[PDB]
Coordinates of C-alpha atoms and ligand atoms in Angstrom, one line a residue:
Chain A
X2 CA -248.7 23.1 -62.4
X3 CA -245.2 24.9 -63.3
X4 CA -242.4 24.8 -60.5
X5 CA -243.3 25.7 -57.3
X6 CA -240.7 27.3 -54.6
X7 CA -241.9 27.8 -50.7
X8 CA -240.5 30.5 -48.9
X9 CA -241.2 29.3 -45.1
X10 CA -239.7 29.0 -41.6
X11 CA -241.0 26.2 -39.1
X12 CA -241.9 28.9 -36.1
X13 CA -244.2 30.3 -38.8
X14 CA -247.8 29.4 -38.1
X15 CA -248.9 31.5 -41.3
X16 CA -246.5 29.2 -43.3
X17 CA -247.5 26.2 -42.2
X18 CA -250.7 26.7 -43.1
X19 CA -249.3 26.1 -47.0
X20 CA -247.3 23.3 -46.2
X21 CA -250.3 21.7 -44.7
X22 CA -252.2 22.8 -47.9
X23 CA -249.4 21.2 -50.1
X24 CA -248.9 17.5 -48.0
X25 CA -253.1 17.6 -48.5
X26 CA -252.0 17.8 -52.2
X27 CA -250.2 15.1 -52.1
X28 CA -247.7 17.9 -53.4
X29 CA -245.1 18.7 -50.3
X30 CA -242.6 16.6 -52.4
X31 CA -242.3 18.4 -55.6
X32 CA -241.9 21.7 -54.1
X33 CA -238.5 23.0 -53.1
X34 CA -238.8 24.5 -49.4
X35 CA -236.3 27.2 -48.2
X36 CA -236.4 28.4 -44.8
X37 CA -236.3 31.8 -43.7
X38 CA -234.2 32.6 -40.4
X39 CA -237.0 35.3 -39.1
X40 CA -234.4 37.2 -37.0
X41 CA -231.7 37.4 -39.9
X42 CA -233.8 37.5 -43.0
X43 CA -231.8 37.6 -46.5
X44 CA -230.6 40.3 -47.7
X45 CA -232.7 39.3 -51.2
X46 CA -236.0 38.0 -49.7
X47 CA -237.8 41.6 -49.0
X48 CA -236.3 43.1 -53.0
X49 CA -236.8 40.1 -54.9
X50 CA -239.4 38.0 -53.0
X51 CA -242.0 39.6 -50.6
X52 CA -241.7 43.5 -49.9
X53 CA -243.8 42.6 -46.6
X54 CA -240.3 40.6 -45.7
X55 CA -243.0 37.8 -44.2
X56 CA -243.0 33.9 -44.7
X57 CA -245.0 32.3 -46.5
X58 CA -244.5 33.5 -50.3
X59 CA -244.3 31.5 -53.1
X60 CA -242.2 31.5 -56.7
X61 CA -244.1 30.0 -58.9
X62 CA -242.9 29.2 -62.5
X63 CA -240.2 30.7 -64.1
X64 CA -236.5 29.3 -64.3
X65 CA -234.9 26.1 -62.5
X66 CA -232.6 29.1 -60.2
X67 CA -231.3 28.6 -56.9
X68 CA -233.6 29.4 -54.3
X69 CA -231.6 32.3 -52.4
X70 CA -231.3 33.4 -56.2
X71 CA -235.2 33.6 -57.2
X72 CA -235.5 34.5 -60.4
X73 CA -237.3 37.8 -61.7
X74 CA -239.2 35.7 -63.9
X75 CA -241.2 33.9 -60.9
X76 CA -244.2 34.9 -59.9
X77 CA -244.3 36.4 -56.4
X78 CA -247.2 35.7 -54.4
X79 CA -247.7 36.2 -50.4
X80 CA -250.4 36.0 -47.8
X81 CA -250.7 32.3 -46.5
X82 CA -254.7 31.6 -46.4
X83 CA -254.7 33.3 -50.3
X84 CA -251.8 30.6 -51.1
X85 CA -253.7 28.2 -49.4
X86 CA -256.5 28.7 -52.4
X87 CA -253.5 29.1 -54.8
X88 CA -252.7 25.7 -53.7
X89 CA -256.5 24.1 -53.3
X90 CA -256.7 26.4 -56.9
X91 CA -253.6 24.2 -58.5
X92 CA -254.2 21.3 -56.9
X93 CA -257.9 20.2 -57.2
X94 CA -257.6 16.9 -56.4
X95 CA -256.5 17.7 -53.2
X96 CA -260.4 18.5 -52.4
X97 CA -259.2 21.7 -50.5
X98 CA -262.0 23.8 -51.7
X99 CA -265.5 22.2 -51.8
X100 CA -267.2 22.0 -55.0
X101 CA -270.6 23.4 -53.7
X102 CA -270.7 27.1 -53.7
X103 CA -272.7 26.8 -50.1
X104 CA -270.4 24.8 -49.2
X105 CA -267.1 27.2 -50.3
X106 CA -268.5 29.8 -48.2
X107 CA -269.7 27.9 -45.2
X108 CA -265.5 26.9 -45.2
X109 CA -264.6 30.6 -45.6
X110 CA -266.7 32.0 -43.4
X111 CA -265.1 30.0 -40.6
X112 CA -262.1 31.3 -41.5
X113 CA -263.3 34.5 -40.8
X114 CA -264.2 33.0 -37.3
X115 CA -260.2 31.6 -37.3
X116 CA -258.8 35.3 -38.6
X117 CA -261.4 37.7 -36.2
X118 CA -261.7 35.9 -33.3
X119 CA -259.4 32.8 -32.5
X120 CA -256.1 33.6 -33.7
X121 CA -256.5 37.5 -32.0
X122 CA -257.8 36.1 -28.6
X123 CA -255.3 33.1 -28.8
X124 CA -252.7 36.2 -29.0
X125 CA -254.3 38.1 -26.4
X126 CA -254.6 35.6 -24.1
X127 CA -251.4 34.4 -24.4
X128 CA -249.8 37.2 -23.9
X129 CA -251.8 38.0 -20.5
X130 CA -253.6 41.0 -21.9
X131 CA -257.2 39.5 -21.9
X132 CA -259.5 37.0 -20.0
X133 CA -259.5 33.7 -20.0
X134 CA -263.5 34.0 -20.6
X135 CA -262.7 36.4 -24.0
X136 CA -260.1 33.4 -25.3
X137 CA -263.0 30.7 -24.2
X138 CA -266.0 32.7 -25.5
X139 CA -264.0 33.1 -29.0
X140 CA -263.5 29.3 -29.3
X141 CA -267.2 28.5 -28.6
X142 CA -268.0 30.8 -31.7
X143 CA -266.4 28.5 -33.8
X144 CA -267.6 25.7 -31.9
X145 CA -271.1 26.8 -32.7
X146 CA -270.5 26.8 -36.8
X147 CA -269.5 22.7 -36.9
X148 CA -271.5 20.3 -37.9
X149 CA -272.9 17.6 -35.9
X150 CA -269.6 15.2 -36.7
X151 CA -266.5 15.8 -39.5
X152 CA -264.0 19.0 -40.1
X153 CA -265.7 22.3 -39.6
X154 CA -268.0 21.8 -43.1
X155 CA -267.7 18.0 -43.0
X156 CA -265.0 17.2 -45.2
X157 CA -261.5 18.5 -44.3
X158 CA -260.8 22.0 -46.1
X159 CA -259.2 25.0 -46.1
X160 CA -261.2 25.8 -43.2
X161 CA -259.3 23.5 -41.2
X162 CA -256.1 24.4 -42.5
X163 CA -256.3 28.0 -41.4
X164 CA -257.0 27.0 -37.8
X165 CA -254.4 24.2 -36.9
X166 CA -251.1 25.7 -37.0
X167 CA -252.3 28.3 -34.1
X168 CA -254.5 24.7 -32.7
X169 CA -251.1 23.6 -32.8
X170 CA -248.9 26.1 -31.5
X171 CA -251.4 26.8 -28.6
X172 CA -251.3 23.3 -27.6
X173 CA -247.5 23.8 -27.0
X174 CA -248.0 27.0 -25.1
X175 CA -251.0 25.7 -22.7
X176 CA -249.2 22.3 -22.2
X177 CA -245.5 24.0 -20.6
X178 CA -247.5 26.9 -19.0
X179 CA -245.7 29.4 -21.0
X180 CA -249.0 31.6 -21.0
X181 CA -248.5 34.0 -18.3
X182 CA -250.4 32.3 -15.6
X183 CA -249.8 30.4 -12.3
X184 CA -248.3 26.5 -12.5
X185 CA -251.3 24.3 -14.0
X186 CA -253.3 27.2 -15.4
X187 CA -251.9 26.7 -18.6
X188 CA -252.8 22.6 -18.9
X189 CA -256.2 23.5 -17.3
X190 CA -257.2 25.5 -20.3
X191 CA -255.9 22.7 -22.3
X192 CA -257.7 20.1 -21.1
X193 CA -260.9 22.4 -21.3
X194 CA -259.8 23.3 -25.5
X195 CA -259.5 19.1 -26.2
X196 CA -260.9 17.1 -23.5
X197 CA -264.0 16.9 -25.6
X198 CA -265.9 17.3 -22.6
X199 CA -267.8 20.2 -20.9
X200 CA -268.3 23.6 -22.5
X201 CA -265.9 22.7 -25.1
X202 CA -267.0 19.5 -25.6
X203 CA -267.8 19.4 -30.0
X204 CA -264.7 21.7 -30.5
X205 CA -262.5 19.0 -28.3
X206 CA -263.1 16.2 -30.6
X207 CA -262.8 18.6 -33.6
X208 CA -259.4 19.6 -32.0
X209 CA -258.6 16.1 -31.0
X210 CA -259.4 15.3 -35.4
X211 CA -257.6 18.4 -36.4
X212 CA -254.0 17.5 -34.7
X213 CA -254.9 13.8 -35.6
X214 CA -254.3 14.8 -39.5
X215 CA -251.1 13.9 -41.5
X216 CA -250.8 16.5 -43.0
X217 CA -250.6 18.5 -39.4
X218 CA -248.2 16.3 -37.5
X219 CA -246.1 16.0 -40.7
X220 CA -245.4 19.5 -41.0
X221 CA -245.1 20.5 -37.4
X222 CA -242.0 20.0 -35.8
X223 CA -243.2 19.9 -32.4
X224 CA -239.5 19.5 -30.8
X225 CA -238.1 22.5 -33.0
X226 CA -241.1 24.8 -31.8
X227 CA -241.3 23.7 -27.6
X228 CA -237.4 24.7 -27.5
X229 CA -238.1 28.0 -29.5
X230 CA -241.3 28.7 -26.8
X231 CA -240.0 27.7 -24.0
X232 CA -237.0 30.1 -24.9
X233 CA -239.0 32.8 -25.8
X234 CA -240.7 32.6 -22.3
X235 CA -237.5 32.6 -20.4
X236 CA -237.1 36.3 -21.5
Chain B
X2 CA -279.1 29.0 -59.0
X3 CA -281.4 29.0 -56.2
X4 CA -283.8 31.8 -55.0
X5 CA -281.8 34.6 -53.5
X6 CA -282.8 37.2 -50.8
X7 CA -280.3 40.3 -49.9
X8 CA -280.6 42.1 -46.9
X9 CA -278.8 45.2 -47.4
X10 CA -279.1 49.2 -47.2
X11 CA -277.6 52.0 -48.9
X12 CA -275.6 53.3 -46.1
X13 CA -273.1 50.4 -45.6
X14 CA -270.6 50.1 -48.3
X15 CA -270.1 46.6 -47.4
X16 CA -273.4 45.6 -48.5
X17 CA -272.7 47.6 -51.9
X18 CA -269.9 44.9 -52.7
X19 CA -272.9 42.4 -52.9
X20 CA -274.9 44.8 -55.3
X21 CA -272.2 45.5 -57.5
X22 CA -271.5 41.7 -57.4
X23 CA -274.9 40.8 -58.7
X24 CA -275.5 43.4 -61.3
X25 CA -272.0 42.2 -62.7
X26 CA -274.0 38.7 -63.0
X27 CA -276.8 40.4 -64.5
X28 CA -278.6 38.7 -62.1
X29 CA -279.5 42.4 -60.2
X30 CA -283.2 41.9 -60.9
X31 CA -283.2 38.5 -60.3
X32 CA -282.9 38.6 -56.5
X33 CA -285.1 40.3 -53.5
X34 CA -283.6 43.2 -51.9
X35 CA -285.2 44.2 -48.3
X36 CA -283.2 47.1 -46.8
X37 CA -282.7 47.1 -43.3
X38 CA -282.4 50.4 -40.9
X39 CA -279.4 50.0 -39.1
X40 CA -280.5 52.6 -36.6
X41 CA -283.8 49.7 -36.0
X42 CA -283.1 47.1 -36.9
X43 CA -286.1 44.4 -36.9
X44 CA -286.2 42.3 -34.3
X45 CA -286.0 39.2 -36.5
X46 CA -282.6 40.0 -38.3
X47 CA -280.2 38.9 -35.6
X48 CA -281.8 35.9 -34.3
X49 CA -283.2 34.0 -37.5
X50 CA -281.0 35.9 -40.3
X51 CA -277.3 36.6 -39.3
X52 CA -276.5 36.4 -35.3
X53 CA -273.9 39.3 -36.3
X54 CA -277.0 42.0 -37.0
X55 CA -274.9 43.3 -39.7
X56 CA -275.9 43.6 -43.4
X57 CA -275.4 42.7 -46.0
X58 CA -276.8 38.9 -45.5
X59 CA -278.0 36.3 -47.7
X60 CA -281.0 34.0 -47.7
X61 CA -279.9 31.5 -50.1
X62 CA -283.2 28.7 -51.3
X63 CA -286.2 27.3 -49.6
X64 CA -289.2 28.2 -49.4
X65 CA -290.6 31.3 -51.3
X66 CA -292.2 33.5 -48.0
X67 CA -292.4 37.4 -47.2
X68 CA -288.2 38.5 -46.8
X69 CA -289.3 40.2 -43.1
X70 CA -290.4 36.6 -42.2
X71 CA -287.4 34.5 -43.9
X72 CA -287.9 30.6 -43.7
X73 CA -286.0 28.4 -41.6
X74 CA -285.2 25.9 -44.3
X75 CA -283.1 28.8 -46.5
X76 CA -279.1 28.8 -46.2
X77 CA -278.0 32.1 -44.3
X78 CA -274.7 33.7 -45.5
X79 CA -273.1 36.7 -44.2
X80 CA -269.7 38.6 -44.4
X81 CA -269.7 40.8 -47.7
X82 CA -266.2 39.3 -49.2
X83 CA -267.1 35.9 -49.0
X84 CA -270.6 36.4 -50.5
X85 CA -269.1 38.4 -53.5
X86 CA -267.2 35.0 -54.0
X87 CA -270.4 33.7 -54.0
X88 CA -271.9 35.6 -56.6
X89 CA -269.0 34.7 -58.5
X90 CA -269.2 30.9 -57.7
X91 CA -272.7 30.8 -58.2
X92 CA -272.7 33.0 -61.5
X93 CA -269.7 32.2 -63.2
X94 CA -270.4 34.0 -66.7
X95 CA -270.0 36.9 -64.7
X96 CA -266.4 36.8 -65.2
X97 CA -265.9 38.3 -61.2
X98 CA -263.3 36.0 -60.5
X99 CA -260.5 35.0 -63.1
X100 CA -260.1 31.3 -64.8
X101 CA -256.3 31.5 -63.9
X102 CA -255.3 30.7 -60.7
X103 CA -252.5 33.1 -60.8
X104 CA -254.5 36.1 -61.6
X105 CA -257.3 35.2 -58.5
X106 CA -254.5 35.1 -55.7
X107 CA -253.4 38.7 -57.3
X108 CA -257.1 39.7 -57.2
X109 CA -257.4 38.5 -53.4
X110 CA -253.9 40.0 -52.5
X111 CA -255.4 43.4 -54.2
X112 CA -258.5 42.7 -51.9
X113 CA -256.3 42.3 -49.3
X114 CA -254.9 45.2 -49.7
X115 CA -258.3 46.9 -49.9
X116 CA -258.9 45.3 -46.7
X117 CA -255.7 46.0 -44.5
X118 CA -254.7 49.3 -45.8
X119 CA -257.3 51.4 -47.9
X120 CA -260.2 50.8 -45.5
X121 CA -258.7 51.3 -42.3
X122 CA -256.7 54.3 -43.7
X123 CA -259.4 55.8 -44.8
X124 CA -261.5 55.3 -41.5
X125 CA -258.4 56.9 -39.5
X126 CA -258.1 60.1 -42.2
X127 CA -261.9 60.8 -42.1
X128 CA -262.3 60.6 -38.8
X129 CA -259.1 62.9 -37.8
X130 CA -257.1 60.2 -36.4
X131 CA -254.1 60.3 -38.9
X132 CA -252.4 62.1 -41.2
X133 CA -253.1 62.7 -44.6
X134 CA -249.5 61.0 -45.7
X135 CA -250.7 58.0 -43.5
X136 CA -254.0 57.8 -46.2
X137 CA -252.1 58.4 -49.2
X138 CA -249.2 55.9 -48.5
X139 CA -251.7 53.5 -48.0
X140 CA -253.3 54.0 -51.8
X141 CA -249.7 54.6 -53.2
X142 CA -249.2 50.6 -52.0
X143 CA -252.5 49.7 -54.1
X144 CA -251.6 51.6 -57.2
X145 CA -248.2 50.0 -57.4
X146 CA -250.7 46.3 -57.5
X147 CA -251.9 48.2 -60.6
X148 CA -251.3 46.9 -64.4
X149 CA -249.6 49.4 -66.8
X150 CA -253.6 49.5 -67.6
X151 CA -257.4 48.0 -66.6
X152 CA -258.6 47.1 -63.5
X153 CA -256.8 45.7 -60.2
X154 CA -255.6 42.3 -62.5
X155 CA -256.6 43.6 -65.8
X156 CA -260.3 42.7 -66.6
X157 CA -262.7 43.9 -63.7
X158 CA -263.1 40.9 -61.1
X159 CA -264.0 40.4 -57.6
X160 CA -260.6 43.3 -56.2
X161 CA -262.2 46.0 -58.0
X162 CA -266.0 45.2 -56.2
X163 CA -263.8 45.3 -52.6
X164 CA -262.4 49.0 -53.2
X165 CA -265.2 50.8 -55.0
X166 CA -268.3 51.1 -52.3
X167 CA -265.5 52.8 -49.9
X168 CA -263.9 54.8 -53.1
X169 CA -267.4 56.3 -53.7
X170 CA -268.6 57.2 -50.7
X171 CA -264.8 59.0 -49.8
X172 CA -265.4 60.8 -52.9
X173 CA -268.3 62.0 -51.3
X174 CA -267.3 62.7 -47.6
X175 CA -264.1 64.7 -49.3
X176 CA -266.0 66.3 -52.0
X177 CA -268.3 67.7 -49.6
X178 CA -265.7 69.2 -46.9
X179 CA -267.1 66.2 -44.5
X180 CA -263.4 65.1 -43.4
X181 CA -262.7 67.2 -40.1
X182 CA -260.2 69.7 -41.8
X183 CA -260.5 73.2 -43.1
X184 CA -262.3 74.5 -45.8
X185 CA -261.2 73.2 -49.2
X186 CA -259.0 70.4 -47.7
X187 CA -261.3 67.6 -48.5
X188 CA -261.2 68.7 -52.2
X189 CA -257.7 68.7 -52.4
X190 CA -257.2 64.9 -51.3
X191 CA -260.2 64.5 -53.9
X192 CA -257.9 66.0 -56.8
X193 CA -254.7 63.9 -55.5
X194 CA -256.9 60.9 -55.6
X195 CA -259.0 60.9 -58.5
X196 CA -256.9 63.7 -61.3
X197 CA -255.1 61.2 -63.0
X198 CA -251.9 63.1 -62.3
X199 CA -249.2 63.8 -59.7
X200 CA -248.0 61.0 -56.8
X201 CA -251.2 58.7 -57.8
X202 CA -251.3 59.6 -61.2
X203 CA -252.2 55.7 -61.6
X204 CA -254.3 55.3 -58.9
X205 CA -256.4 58.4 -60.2
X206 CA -257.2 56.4 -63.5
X207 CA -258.2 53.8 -62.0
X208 CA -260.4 55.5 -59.7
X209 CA -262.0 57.0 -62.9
X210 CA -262.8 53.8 -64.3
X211 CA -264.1 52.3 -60.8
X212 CA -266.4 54.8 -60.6
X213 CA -267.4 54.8 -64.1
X214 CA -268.4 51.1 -64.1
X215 CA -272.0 50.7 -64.8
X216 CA -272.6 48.3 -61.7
X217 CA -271.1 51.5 -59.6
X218 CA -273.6 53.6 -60.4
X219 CA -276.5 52.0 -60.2
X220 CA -276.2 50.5 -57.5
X221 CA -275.2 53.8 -54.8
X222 CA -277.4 56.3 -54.3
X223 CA -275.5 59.4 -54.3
X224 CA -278.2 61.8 -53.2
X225 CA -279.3 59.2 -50.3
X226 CA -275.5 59.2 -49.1
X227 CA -275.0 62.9 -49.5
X228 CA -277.8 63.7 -47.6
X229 CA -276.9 61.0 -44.4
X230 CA -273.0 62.4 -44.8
X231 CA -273.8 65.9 -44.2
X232 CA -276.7 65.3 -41.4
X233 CA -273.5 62.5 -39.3
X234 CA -271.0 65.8 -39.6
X235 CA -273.6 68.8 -38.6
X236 CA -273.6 66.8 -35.3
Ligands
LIG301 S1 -245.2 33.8 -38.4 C1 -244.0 34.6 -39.4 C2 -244.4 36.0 -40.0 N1 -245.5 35.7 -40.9 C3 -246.5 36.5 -40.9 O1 -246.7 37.4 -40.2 C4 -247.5 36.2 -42.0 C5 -248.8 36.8 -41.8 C6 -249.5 37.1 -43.2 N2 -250.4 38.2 -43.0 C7 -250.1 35.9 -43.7 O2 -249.6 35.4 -44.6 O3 -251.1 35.4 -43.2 C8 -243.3 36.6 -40.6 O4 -242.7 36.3 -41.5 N3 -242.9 37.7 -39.9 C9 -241.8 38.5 -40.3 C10 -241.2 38.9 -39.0 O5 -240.2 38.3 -38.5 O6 -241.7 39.9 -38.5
LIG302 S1 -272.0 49.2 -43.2 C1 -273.2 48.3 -42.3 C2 -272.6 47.4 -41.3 N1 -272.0 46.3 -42.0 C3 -270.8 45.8 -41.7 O1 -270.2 46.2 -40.7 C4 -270.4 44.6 -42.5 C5 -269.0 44.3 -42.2 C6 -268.7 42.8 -42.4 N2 -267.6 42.5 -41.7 C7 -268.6 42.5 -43.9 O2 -269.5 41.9 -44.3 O3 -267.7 42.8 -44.6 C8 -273.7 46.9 -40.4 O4 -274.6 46.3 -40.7 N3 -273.5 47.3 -39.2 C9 -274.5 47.1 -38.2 C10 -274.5 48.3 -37.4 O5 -275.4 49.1 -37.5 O6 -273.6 48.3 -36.5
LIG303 O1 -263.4 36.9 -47.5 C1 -262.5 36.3 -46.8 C2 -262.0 37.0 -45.6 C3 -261.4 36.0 -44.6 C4 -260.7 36.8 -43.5 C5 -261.4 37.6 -42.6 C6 -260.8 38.4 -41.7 C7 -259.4 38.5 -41.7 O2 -258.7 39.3 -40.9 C8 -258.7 37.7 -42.6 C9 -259.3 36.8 -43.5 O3 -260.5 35.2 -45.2 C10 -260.8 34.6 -46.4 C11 -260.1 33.4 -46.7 C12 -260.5 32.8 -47.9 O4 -259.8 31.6 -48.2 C13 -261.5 33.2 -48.7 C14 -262.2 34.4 -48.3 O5 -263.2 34.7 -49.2 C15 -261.9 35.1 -47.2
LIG304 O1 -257.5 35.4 -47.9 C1 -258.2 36.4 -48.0 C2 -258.0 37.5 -47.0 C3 -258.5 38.8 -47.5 C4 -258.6 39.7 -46.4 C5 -257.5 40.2 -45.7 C6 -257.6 41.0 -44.6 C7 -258.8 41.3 -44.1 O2 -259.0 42.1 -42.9 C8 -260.0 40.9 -44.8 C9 -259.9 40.2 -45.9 O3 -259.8 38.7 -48.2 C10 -260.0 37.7 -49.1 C11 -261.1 37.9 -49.9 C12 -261.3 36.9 -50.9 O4 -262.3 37.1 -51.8 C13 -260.5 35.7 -50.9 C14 -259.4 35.6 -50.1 O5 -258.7 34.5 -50.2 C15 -259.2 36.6 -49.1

């Protein structure tokens, strides 16, 4: 594939799911990373990069150019889980996307599960806007579409990939009880999300397998994000 | 492929992007429909075809048996999107998603668009929510995805199928006056949308061509929609 530069920022969990897509890929080493400072964004990154001013985009091809300078001559793509089939697209080897058409669906279809229910009642929740019951309920969905062992089709795929970096992230909220709630509340839901016991019991080992990946812990830098949230909280 | 069954019905433009997508394939009269009334809705549908009761669903192999009594042993697919991907997977002289990877990230970041601006827009506009600016900012940011000429990347693909059910059927609740505004209103937007000329000059081309497209065409009954448009308003 021609040259390949990663607009990103570590606090992103949108981005990560690429670099997650690219270490699968066996790729994360001939890409040139630049992060993105969210609360002072370059001047350049919203004219010449992404309109939408949001991490992840990619330039892809074009020029050898500095990567505050991207060249016109890249192409400009955005939206992580469509670079993540950009990626799984470039990539094959990497076994991203299944080959079986049953199979491709089954994968995106659960990431319809990730986008219209797990990531909105992880945000709701979170926050302290919704139940604990909606946030539980929304994770037993997904719960319900994995097979009887393996990723959420068998084989790890871009279904997986969608999910962890919020798996992730959530973790780190739950664990410091910087969700809103009374002292232990937070590490009680944990426990209940990846104990792989009790209601939750198939989508605790499946959590357990998806923050056991490389390519999660290798692009997660769990010190960088537990200052940011902690932080954050303190507000 | 395998044997296909569609649950669908001419009201929901979500099921349409299945139609379109298999009369693309040529593969229209290749595959059961059974339509389903969304105001009673069989009792079978949720429970043993999709959990969601929505249409459109697929039953994808097994057993040949009566659609009201699908089999067990066939593979159930819902969520229109993905099963247009399908389609394309499954039917790849179609040409409904693009060889390069480039130009099938464009084509989902069009859909994308489709998805997070257009439709919503639209829903708000009809319904007397928003403002008409609101609506035609939103297709101003999808006619500037556009090619100097051709569909959403060029040739007709899988971002075109997204847009047109919703295109069509607007074209219908403004042509008709059925947009909660005064008399001659709806028409207007109509004109600004569709006469090749003015703010979304670009736009109305395209529109032309979407709803020229054979697969269009037959695939929506206009006089079935018409009729149900006008009956939702008089209440
Ligand atoms: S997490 C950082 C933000 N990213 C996104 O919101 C990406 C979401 C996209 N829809 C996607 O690619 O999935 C971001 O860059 N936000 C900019 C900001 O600071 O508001
Ligand atoms: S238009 C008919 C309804 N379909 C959908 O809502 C499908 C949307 C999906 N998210 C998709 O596939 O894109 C429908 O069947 N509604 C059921 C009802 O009557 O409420
Ligand atoms: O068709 C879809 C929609 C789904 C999605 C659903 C809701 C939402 O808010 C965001 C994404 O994401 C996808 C991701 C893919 O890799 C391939 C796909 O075909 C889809
Ligand atoms: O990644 C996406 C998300 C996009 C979408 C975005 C927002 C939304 O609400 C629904 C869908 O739909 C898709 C449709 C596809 O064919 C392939 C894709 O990769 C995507």
């Amino acid at each position: 594939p021609e040259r390949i530069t990663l607009y990103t920022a570590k606090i992103c969990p949108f981005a990560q799911r690429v670099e997650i897509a690219l270490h699968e890929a066996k790729a994360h080493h001939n890409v040139e990373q630049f992060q993105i400072d969210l609360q002072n964004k370059p001047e350049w990154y919203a004219p010449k990069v992404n309109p939408a001013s949001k991490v992840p985009a990619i330039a892809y091809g074009g020029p050898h150019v500095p990567p505050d300078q991207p060249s016109p001559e890249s192409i400009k793509l955005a939206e992580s889980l469509i670079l993540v089939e950009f990626v799984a697209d470039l990539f094959p080897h990497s076994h991203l996307l299944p080959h079986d058409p049953v199979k491709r669906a089954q994968a995106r279809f659960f990431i319809d599960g990730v986008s219209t229910k797990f990531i909105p009642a992880w945000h709701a929740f979170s926050q302290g806007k919704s139940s604990e019951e909606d946030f539980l309920t929304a994770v037993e969905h997904l719960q319900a579409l994995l097979p009887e062992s393996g990723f959420a089709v068998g084989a790890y795929s871009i279904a997986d990939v969608a999910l962890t970096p919020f798996l992730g992230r959530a973790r780190v909220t739950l664990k410091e009880d910087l969700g809103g709630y009374p002292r232990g509340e937070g590490p009680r839901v944990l426990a209940v999300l990846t104990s792989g016991t009790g209601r939750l019991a198939r989508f605790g080992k499946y959590a357990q397998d998806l923050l056991a990946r490389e390519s999660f812990q290798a692009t997660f830098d769990e010190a960088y994000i537990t200052e940011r949230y902690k932080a954050r909280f303190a507000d």
